Design an enzyme around this catalytic site. Structure first.
Site, short mmCIF file in Angstrom:
data_model
loop_
_atom_site.label_atom_id
_atom_site.label_comp_id
_atom_site.label_asym_id
_atom_site.label_seq_id
_atom_site.Cartn_x
_atom_site.Cartn_y
_atom_site.Cartn_z
N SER A 214 10.06 -1.64 -2.11
CA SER A 214 9.46 -0.91 -1.12
C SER A 214 9.91 1.09 -1.37
CB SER A 214 9.43 -0.93 0.53
OG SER A 214 8.71 -0.44 1.06
N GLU A 347 0.12 -7.08 0.10
CA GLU A 347 1.02 -6.21 0.72
C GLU A 347 0.32 -6.24 1.63
OE1 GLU A 347 3.80 -5.91 -2.96
OE2 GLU A 347 3.64 -5.14 -0.71
N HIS A 467 3.89 -6.87 2.17
CA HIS A 467 5.10 -6.82 1.73
C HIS A 467 6.13 -7.06 2.50
CE1 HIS A 467 5.99 -2.72 0.16
NE2 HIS A 467 6.64 -2.50 1.42
B1 LIG Z 1 8.71 0.81 1.69
O1 LIG Z 1 9.71 1.70 1.90
C1 LIG Z 1 7.35 0.62 3.04
C2 LIG Z 1 7.55 1.39 4.31
C3 LIG Z 1 7.02 1.80 5.29
C4 LIG Z 1 5.15 1.39 4.88
O2 LIG Z 1 4.47 2.27 5.70
C5 LIG Z 1 4.72 2.71 6.93
C6 LIG Z 1 5.26 1.80 8.02
C7 LIG Z 1 6.30 2.06 8.71
C8 LIG Z 1 6.90 1.57 9.96
C9 LIG Z 1 6.13 0.48 10.32
C10 LIG Z 1 4.70 0.05 9.42
C11 LIG Z 1 4.78 0.67 8.59
F1 LIG Z 1 3.75 0.29 7.22
C12 LIG Z 1 4.87 1.46 3.52
CL1 LIG Z 1 3.53 2.03 2.90
C13 LIG Z 1 6.09 1.83 2.44
#
Ligand SMILES: *B(O)c1ccc(OCc2ccccc2F)c(Cl)c1
Length: 566
Positions: A214, A347, A467
């Protein structure tokens, strides 16, 4: 926020400390570093393995007081023996479960793990950079335990780095020396430390692999892009992310004033005055208010985080990003080291929790205008060309007459991960010495062994490989358990640590010593490839064409009339 996640999470945390104590030993050891001696300790795993543990090794000065928002400076060394038998705190952040701010500004540490402090051969060194959107995460072993990797004869190092506004505030004013990217400059300083010290822990300083998931994958990619790190390492693995993902950078110079005003700043929009206020504020106040900084307009236009990696407005001594990442790919030293990239098979399932909060998001897929790459879209997303571009996305992901939540999450898979990967591969193919890129697709689905992100994403009961689901097969966490040696989960642990260790060693992820790989012909991607091949990792390991390729070309088609921007 459903309150007593925080309970069992508190009582999984009262357990994790007893277990941590029980898995500690009395075998302490001292190693040399360029700043002084560190005392580490052997720890046990639930698989009846053991490893030497050095935690809280400082690689920079605590970035507190006048050092807040500034590039890291080298730490101050010591005579005698520094205690590294306990972890330090994580960077200041909002606990995604307890909703409360935790951590410390004093967070610039790394941890070193190995099953053999005095190996008979120099070992590959693997450096893990954690994800968390540049706003959460840590190198604590309750989330990123080395217990699986130390079954292999490697040295594993888990770094921390500054998060949120404390890591990524950026001010235009050259006089203030807050150009941005302090958290990435933290990573650079950690990489320099590792290069210069890993030998003291049995590591081969000429065989270092950086990997991350991520925001950690975007970080790894940034460490391959910047000239600051040239030749510090020799392989890279990008797990579900890279630096040209739309969430991986932002021009946030105007948002410091907003953050200040949220925290009670009284005065004008002036960089100097704003910096002075932000220097004095309680760190936990700034981090808690961070979630309110983005405007409705920014959120609509898919700006994910208010502070993150940024193109720095002027060039300073420790500058990491002088240009947009797409520009930095043109001359990146990291283009010419062996590279592996991959994503999971669903993802977008990660955004389940966001959808449950804001169901109206699904109606964004009526036209899809909001998911048109921002460089192509107009600000109101009402332009007829934007409507046309949106219609191309819509056709890729809307399966019925009306969009569904699954359609939304499938779209997110491509917007946030697969399409950026495509753009990177194609961009890099114009500027590479010719070193291989290998692709994987992580497609192993299990609910029998999980990690804490599954809680956050409310993915218990949901099926598909989201993800972060792969982290479970690389790292121990406080929700894990000892699995039967014959279980599909245990075999997946062995395969994943195995392939990653093989790639770290040789720059080629294939080995017939890995069960399931007996027939894998894993070939890297070529410029002349119209279809990407990947190793699909499920219960079986199989080479396949990337199933996402069709939708990837559909996204690409939005750039038919703007090919220079692709
Ligand atoms: B990778 O580090 C990453 C973290 C969060 C993302 O989306 C923001 C988010 C924050 C908290 C909960 C769920 C979420 F989707 C993304 Cl795209 C990558």
């Amino acid at each position: 926020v459903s309150l007593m996640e925080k309970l069992k999470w508190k009582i999984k945390c009262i357990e994790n400390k007893f277990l941590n104590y029980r898995l500690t030993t009395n075998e302490t050891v001292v190693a040399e570093t360029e700043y002084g001696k560190v005392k580490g300790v052997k720890r046990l795993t639930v698989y009846d393995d053991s490893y030497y543990s050095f935690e809280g090794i400082p690689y920079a000065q605590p970035p507190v007081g006048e050092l807040r928002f500034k590039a890291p400076q080298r730490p101050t060394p010591w005579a005698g023996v520094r205690d590294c038998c306990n972890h330090k705190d994580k960077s200041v952040q909002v606990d995604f479960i307890t909703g409360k701010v935790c951590g410390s500004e004093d967070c610039l540490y790394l941890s070193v793990y190995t099953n053999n402090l005095n190996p008979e051969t120099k070992r590959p060194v693997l450096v893990y950079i954690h994800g968390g959107g540049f706003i959460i995460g840590e190198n604590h072993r309750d989330m990123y335990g080395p217990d699986y990797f130390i079954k292999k004869d490697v040295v594993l190092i888990n770094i921390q780095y500054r998060l949120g506004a404390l890591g990524f505030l950026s001010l235009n004013s050259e006089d203030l020396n807050v150009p941005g990217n302090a958290g990435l400059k933290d990573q650079v300083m950690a990489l320099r430390w590792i290069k210069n010290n890993c030998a003291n822990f049995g590591g081969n300083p000429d065989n270092i692999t950086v990997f991350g998931e991520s925001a950690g994958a975007a970080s790894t990619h940034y460490m391959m892009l910047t000239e600051q790190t040239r030749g510090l390492f020799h392989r890279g693995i990008l797990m579900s992310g890279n630096a040209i993902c739309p969430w991986a950078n932002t021009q946030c110079q105007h948002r410091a004033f907003t953050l200040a005003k949220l925290a009670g700043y009284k005065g004008e929009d002036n960089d100097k005055d704003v910096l002075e206020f932000l220097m004095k504020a309680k760190p936990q106040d700034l981090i808690k208010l961070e979630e309110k900084v983005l405007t409705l307009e920014e959120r609509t236009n898919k700006v994910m985080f208010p502070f993150g990696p940024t193109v720095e407005p002027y060039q300073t001594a420790d500058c990491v990003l002088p240009k947009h990442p797409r520009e930095m790919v043109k001359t990146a030293w990291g283009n010419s080291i062996p590279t592996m990239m991959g994503n999971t098979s669903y993802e977008g399932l990660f955004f389940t929790s966001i959808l449950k909060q804001m169901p109206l998001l699904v109606k964004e897929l009526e036209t899809c205008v909001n998911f048109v790459p921002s460089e192509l879209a107009d600000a109101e997303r009402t332009a007829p060309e934007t409507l046309e571009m949106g219609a191309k996305i819509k056709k890729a992901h809307v399966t019925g007459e009306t969009p569904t939540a699954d359609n939304f999450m499938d779209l997110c898979s491509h917007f946030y991960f697969w399409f950026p990967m495509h753009r990177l591969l194609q961009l890099r193919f114009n500027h590479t010495s010719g070193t291989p890129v290998y692709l994987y697709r992580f497609d192993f689905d299990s609910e029998d062994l999980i990690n804490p992100y599954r809680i956050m994403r409310s993915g218990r009961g949901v099926k598909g490989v989201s993800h972060t689901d792969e982290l479970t097969y690389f790292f121990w966490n406080q929700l894990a358990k000892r699995m039967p040696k014959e279980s599909r989960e245990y075999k997946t642990i062995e395969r994943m640590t195995g392939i990653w260790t093989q790639f770290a060693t040789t720059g080629n992820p294939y080995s017939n010593e890995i069960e399931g790989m007996e027939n894998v012909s894993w070939d890297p991607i070529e410029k002349s490839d119209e279809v990407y091949k990947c190793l699909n990792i499920s219960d079986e390991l199989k080479m396949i064409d990337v199933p996402e390729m069709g939708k990837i070309k559909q996204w690409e088609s939005m750039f038919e009339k703007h090919r220079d921007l692709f």
